Amino acid sequence: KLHKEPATLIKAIDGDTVKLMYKGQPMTFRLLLVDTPETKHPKKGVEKYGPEASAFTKKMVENAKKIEVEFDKGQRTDKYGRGLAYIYADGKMVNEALVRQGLAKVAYVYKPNNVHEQHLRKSEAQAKKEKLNIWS
Numbered sequence: 455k456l457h458k459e460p461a462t463l464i465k466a467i468d469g470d471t472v473k474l475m476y477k478g479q480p481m482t483f484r485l486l487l488v489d490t491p492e493t494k495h496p497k498k499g500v501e502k503y504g505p506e507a508s509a510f511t512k513k514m515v516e517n518a519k520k521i522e523v524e525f526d527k528g529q530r531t532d533k534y535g536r537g538l539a540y541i542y543a544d545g546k547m548v549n550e551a552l553v554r555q556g557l558a559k560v561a562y563v564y565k566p567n568n569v570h571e572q573h574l575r576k577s578e579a580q581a582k583k584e585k586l587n588i589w590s
Contacts (some may be wrong), residue, residue, distance in 0.1 A: 458522035461551040469507030518543035526567035556586030
């Protein structure tokens with residue numbers, strides 16, 4: 455089964471990336487299954503809603519009492535060294551919150567890291583129906 459492990463915030467870096475202290479080591483975490491508009495896009499740069507997604511993730515993790523990380527069932531790091539995880543702030547999944555708010559889309563899914571896929575797709579569908587942010 456998947457289980458959560460505690461972590462401590464170091465710095466929110468962008469909408470889709472946060473640096474955490476995990477098992478006593480600083481590490482960069484990429485949020486699984488979501489694509490946010492980025493402020494730090496490799497080519498693009500600062501896309502529309504980038505600033506908004508980035509501020510949303512930052513507030514959510516900076517104002518939390520407890521941060522937890524949840525790994526999926528496949529690879530736990532990507533080719534850049536970043537942890538691949540679902541991040542929880544006081545019990546609430548940051549990945550889902552972003553999608554629910556129309557501040558992220560569900561990404562292209564590489565099995566078998568897809569455990570919360572349907573759940574996020576349901577939230578994405580609701581944000582589209584409500585025409586929030588990216589979908590407005």
